[PDB]
Design a protein around this ligand. Sequence first.
Ligand code: SF4
Ligand code: SF4
Length: 55
Amino acid sequence: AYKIADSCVSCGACASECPVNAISQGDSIFVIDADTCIDCGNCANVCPVGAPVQE
Ligand code: SF4
Ligand code: SF4
């Protein structure tokens, strides 16, 4: 599991994209239920700026 890191702008276009919908806007930008994310590569594949990357 990763984070939506600071590369993220609040663009929205990954929330619904996660097969397990393990995403929402959280701290400031998008966020991941990292518990519940499995390292599937989707989201990371979709994000215009590849922000699904870790804390
Ligand atoms: S890597 Fe896959 S399971 Fe994890 S948040 Fe992204 S889309 Fe969802
Ligand atoms: S697609 Fe990328 S930039 Fe858009 S909300 Fe998701 S992580 Fe942030």
